[PDB]
Design an enzyme around this catalytic site. Sequence first.
Site, PDB file in Angstrom:
ATOM      1  N   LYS A   1       0.117   3.703  -2.861  1.00 40.36           N
ATOM      2  CA  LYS A   1      -0.895   4.720  -2.660  1.00 40.36           C
ATOM      3  C   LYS A   1      -0.283   6.086  -2.559  1.00 40.36           C
ATOM      4  CE  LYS A   1      -5.020   2.368  -1.436  1.00 40.36           C
ATOM      5  NZ  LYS A   1      -4.737   0.880  -1.237  1.00 40.36           N
TER       6      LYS A   1
ATOM      7  N   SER B   1       0.770  -1.225   0.000  1.00 42.29           N
ATOM      8  CA  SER B   1       0.000   0.000   0.000  1.00 42.29           C
ATOM      9  C   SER B   1       0.805   1.280   0.000  1.00 42.29           C
ATOM     10  CB  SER B   1      -1.059  -0.022   1.088  1.00 42.29           C
ATOM     11  OG  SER B   1      -2.117  -0.849   0.643  1.00 42.29           O
TER      12      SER B   1
ATOM     13  N   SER C   1      -6.322   3.394   4.022  1.00 41.06           N
ATOM     14  CA  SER C   1      -5.802   2.689   2.853  1.00 41.06           C
ATOM     15  C   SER C   1      -6.951   2.138   1.969  1.00 41.06           C
ATOM     16  CB  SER C   1      -4.846   1.570   3.317  1.00 41.06           C
ATOM     17  OG  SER C   1      -3.959   1.130   2.303  1.00 41.06           O
TER      18      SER C   1
HETATM   19  B1  LIG Z   1      -2.612  -1.989   1.386  1.00 44.08           B
HETATM   20  O1  LIG Z   1      -3.295  -1.372   2.618  1.00 44.08           O
HETATM   21  O2  LIG Z   1      -1.360  -2.764   1.804  1.00 44.08           O
HETATM   22  C1  LIG Z   1      -3.664  -3.004   0.731  1.00 44.08           C
HETATM   23  C2  LIG Z   1      -3.158  -3.439  -0.624  1.00 44.08           C
HETATM   24  N1  LIG Z   1      -3.809  -4.176   1.567  1.00 44.08           N
HETATM   25  S1  LIG Z   1      -4.764  -5.339   1.231  1.00 44.08           S
HETATM   26  C3  LIG Z   1      -3.849  -6.643   0.768  1.00 44.08           C
HETATM   27  O3  LIG Z   1      -5.759  -5.022   0.160  1.00 44.08           O
HETATM   28  O4  LIG Z   1      -5.514  -5.734   2.452  1.00 44.08           O
END
Ligand SMILES: *[B-](O)(O)[C@@H](C)NS(C)(=O)=O
Length: 466
Positions: free
Chosen positions: A52, A49, A298
């Site tokens: 992002k 993430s 996120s």
């Molecule tokens: B990010 O918050 O790391 C996002 C891609 N996490 S996930 C695997 O969709 O829970």
Amino acid sequence: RLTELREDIDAILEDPALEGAVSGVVVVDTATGEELYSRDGGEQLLPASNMKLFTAAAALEVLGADHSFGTEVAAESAPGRRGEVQDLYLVGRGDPTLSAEDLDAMAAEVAASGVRTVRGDLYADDTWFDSERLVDDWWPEDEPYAYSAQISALTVAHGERFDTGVTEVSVTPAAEGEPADVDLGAAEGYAELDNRAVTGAAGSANTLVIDRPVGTNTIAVTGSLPADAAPVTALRTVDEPAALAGHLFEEALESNGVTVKGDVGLGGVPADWQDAEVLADHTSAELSEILVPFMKFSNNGHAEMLVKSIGQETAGAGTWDAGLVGVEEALSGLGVDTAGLVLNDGSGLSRGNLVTADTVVDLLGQAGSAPWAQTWSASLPVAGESDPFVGGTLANRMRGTAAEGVVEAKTGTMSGVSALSGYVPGPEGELAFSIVNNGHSGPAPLAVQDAIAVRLAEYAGHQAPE
Ligand SMILES: *[B-](O)(O)[C@@H](C)NS(C)(=O)=O
Ligand SMILES: [Mg+2]
Ligand SMILES: [Mg+2]
């Protein structure tokens, strides 16, 4: 001083969790431009993430702090005397923050503009983006869940977090041996229910499964729920988000005093329509304030939606291929070396992503001097802060430490990928740092991330609250 910091971080990166993991660790003092610490700065790693960061700095560049998204409802003519329209088109244009309260307010306007009877069908026009719902390499087993929710121009966002393409399922328990009450949320009447779940004895095993099987629009609930259990709520995705927003706007009109005579389906305003009469419009919050729920918690859905929106600004195309290039372009234009990068999506959900830590630090320095610096900085999760909308993913992390209410970083996390990059704004220089960890065997090296960050908070000149 200065060398002490080295030993401290060197030692932190000896943990048993780092058995056979690669770790990119880069720390730079913004003010001096001094390379405080660098280890595998150029090494290429999956960001999770932390992708992002890029998508967010690029949405700013390309879309502007003040960019807002609009929803429109159209018919081929205005209602006259008899208050009759034919086909009615719900036309979304990339709104990530679109609630059922907004469809009501638009159904309020449809009635008040004089429509009483939609004689034809009500149609969902999400053509503003392509109909490509999931990136190439996302997993079919991820599909049911909020983070793997489909991408559309016309999506219904849930909660104040704005979780798109999902309905909240509720499983209240009943009596022992009886089936439990399953409540499909907004998607009631849109999605199928396959309720096989039963209410078990008091204090019994909780094995309740709420699933949506691949390629179906069926909410298949299984398992058991105790008679005494606290009623369960869980986010599940629907097939075709706009078709649900269709169904939900259906309900709204029925409610606001508009009889709808035909079916509900997916459809784009026909080309033969010359001068459309727009019966309801809406306007989202300005991007800058949409950055908050997007970066704090996120949000994946937000990321991709923003990309494809980036693909509309620069290319006129709600397409990943279109926006990703545009994203790469903007960062280049931001002063960023894109040598290390490889973009396969906006959220960092794709394993097709690659970053280096020097690249993240590179980004952070640049974005920091941008005319949009402060809303970007703000959107970021803040260490140890109880408030979800300030703590974000760092709410229950680094509490009671020199990093509390101090470190502004963003997290990246998935199977065998963990990441922390951002700002430690201290009296001894605003620090920017990146920590990227790939392919670890056991637990998440979150302890090694916090440890580094807290030590850096201390180097910056902070001290732990007592
Ligand atoms: B990010 O918050 O790391 C996002 C891609 N996490 S996930 C695997 O969709 O829970
Ligand atoms: Mg319904
Ligand atoms: Mg402090």
